[PDB]
Amino acid sequence: VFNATRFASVYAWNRKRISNCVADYSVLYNSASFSTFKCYGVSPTKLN
Amino acid sequence: KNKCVNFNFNGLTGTGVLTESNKKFLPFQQFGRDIADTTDAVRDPQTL
Amino acid sequence: GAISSVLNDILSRLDPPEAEVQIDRLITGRLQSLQTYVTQQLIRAAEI
Ligand SMILES: *[C@@H]1O[C@H](CO)[C@@H](O)[C@H](O)[C@H]1NC(C)=O
Numbered sequence: 001v002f003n004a005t006r007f008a009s010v011y012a013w014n015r016k017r018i019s020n021c022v023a024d025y026s027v028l029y030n031s032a033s034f035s036t037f038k039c040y041g042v043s044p045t046k047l048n
Numbered sequence: 049k050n051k052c053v054n055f056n057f058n059g060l061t062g063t064g065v066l067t068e069s070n071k072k073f074l075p076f077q078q079f080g081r082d083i084a085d086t087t088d089a090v091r092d093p094q095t096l
Numbered sequence: 097g098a099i100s101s102v103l104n105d106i107l108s109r110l111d112p113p114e115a116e117v118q119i120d121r122l123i124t125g126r127l128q129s130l131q132t133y134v135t136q137q138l139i140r141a142a143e144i
Binding site for chain 3: 041042046
Binding site: 059061062085086 | 104
Protein backbone atom coordinates (compact mmCIF):
# COMPACT_ATOMS: atom_id res chain seq x y z
CA VAL A 1 0.00 0.00 0.00
CA PHE A 2 2.79 2.47 0.78
CA ASN A 3 5.18 1.58 -2.04
CA ALA A 4 2.64 0.95 -4.81
CA THR A 5 3.61 2.27 -8.23
CA ARG A 6 0.44 4.35 -8.65
CA PHE A 7 -2.26 5.72 -6.37
CA ALA A 8 -5.86 6.08 -7.47
CA SER A 9 -7.48 9.48 -7.81
CA VAL A 10 -9.30 10.74 -4.74
CA TYR A 11 -12.72 10.44 -6.37
CA ALA A 12 -12.02 6.71 -6.78
CA TRP A 13 -9.78 6.33 -3.73
CA ASN A 14 -8.37 2.83 -3.40
CA ARG A 15 -9.13 0.81 -0.27
CA LYS A 16 -7.08 -2.12 1.00
CA ARG A 17 -8.34 -4.24 3.90
CA ILE A 18 -5.47 -5.31 6.16
CA SER A 19 -6.31 -8.31 8.32
CA ASN A 20 -4.93 -11.55 9.77
CA CYS A 21 -1.36 -10.35 10.18
CA VAL A 22 1.05 -8.74 12.64
CA ALA A 23 1.61 -5.02 12.10
CA ASP A 24 4.87 -3.31 13.09
CA TYR A 25 4.10 0.42 13.17
CA SER A 26 7.53 1.34 14.57
CA VAL A 27 9.11 1.30 11.10
CA LEU A 28 6.32 3.62 9.95
CA TYR A 29 6.68 6.06 12.84
CA ASN A 30 10.49 6.31 12.95
CA SER A 31 10.82 6.92 9.20
CA ALA A 32 11.29 10.55 8.17
CA SER A 33 9.57 9.89 4.83
CA PHE A 34 6.18 11.38 5.78
CA SER A 35 5.36 15.08 6.02
CA THR A 36 2.00 14.48 7.73
CA PHE A 37 1.63 11.56 10.18
CA LYS A 38 -1.30 12.44 12.44
CA CYS A 39 -3.05 9.67 14.36
CA TYR A 40 -6.60 10.56 15.39
CA GLY A 41 -8.25 9.04 18.43
CA VAL A 42 -5.11 6.99 19.08
CA SER A 43 -1.44 7.62 19.74
CA PRO A 44 1.27 6.68 17.21
CA THR A 45 3.68 5.36 19.84
CA LYS A 46 0.98 3.22 21.47
CA LEU A 47 0.24 1.41 18.19
CA ASN A 48 2.67 -1.45 18.87
CA LYS B 49 -3.01 -18.23 37.33
CA ASN B 50 -4.41 -17.44 40.78
CA LYS B 51 -2.09 -14.43 41.09
CA CYS B 52 -2.87 -10.72 40.98
CA VAL B 53 -1.25 -9.68 37.69
CA ASN B 54 -1.41 -7.00 35.00
CA PHE B 55 -2.87 -9.10 32.20
CA ASN B 56 -3.14 -8.05 28.55
CA PHE B 57 -5.19 -10.29 26.23
CA ASN B 58 -5.40 -8.87 22.69
CA GLY B 59 -5.09 -5.31 23.98
CA LEU B 60 -7.64 -5.98 26.73
CA THR B 61 -5.74 -4.67 29.75
CA GLY B 62 -6.72 -5.27 33.34
CA THR B 63 -5.64 -6.40 36.78
CA GLY B 64 -6.94 -9.44 38.58
CA VAL B 65 -6.50 -13.12 39.34
CA LEU B 66 -7.05 -15.53 36.45
CA THR B 67 -8.63 -18.83 37.48
CA GLU B 68 -9.76 -21.87 35.53
CA SER B 69 -13.45 -21.13 35.06
CA ASN B 70 -16.41 -23.42 34.40
CA LYS B 71 -18.32 -20.94 32.23
CA LYS B 72 -19.94 -22.59 29.21
CA PHE B 73 -18.66 -20.39 26.42
CA LEU B 74 -20.01 -21.20 23.00
CA PRO B 75 -17.29 -21.79 20.36
CA PHE B 76 -17.67 -18.26 19.00
CA GLN B 77 -17.97 -16.38 22.31
CA GLN B 78 -14.72 -14.61 23.21
CA PHE B 79 -15.19 -13.17 26.69
CA GLY B 80 -17.91 -12.64 29.26
CA ARG B 81 -19.34 -9.52 30.87
CA ASP B 82 -21.05 -8.82 34.18
CA ILE B 83 -23.97 -6.50 34.87
CA ALA B 84 -21.50 -3.60 35.17
CA ASP B 85 -20.57 -4.20 31.50
CA THR B 86 -16.94 -4.80 32.44
CA THR B 87 -14.70 -7.71 31.50
CA ASP B 88 -15.46 -10.73 33.67
CA ALA B 89 -14.04 -13.87 32.00
CA VAL B 90 -11.86 -14.22 28.90
CA ARG B 91 -10.49 -16.66 26.34
CA ASP B 92 -6.74 -17.00 26.05
CA PRO B 93 -5.83 -15.78 22.53
CA GLN B 94 -3.46 -18.74 22.12
CA THR B 95 -5.62 -21.38 23.81
CA LEU B 96 -9.41 -21.72 23.58
CA GLY C 97 -18.16 12.45 25.56
CA ALA C 98 -14.89 10.55 25.98
CA ILE C 99 -13.66 8.14 23.33
CA SER C 100 -14.23 5.14 25.60
CA SER C 101 -16.08 4.44 28.82
CA VAL C 102 -13.15 2.28 29.99
CA LEU C 103 -10.29 4.18 31.61
CA ASN C 104 -7.71 1.52 30.76
CA ASP C 105 -8.52 1.73 27.05
CA ILE C 106 -7.94 5.49 27.02
CA LEU C 107 -4.73 5.07 29.01
CA SER C 108 -3.42 2.35 26.67
CA ARG C 109 -4.51 4.23 23.54
CA LEU C 110 -3.50 7.86 24.08
CA ASP C 111 -0.47 9.93 24.98
CA PRO C 112 -0.72 11.78 28.31
CA PRO C 113 -1.69 15.17 26.78
CA GLU C 114 -4.90 13.75 25.23
CA ALA C 115 -5.47 11.08 27.84
CA GLU C 116 -5.71 14.03 30.23
CA VAL C 117 -8.63 15.54 28.30
CA GLN C 118 -10.47 12.24 27.94
CA ILE C 119 -9.93 11.26 31.58
CA ASP C 120 -11.07 14.73 32.63
CA ARG C 121 -14.32 14.16 30.77
CA LEU C 122 -14.82 10.78 32.44
CA ILE C 123 -13.89 12.16 35.87
CA THR C 124 -16.42 14.97 35.51
CA GLY C 125 -19.16 12.53 34.55
CA ARG C 126 -18.44 9.95 37.23
CA LEU C 127 -17.97 12.52 39.98
CA GLN C 128 -21.32 14.05 39.10
CA SER C 129 -22.79 10.55 39.28
CA LEU C 130 -21.48 10.10 42.82
CA GLN C 131 -22.70 13.57 43.75
CA THR C 132 -26.19 12.64 42.57
CA TYR C 133 -26.11 9.30 44.38
CA VAL C 134 -24.94 10.79 47.67
CA THR C 135 -27.53 13.57 47.57
CA GLN C 136 -30.34 11.09 46.94
CA GLN C 137 -29.01 8.88 49.72
CA LEU C 138 -28.93 11.78 52.18
CA ILE C 139 -32.53 12.72 51.39
CA ARG C 140 -33.66 9.09 51.60
CA ALA C 141 -31.77 8.58 54.86
CA ALA C 142 -33.49 11.62 56.34
CA GLU C 143 -36.82 10.02 55.41
CA ILE C 144 -35.74 6.71 56.95
C1 LIG D 1 -0.12 -21.24 18.31
O1 LIG D 1 -1.49 -21.08 18.67
C2 LIG D 1 -2.28 -22.25 18.41
C3 LIG D 1 -3.71 -21.88 18.70
O2 LIG D 1 -4.60 -22.47 17.77
C4 LIG D 1 -1.77 -23.41 19.25
O3 LIG D 1 -2.52 -24.58 18.94
C5 LIG D 1 -0.29 -23.65 18.98
O4 LIG D 1 0.22 -24.63 19.88
C6 LIG D 1 0.51 -22.36 19.14
N1 LIG D 1 1.89 -22.57 18.76
C7 LIG D 1 2.91 -21.89 19.30
C8 LIG D 1 4.28 -22.23 18.79
O5 LIG D 1 2.73 -21.03 20.16
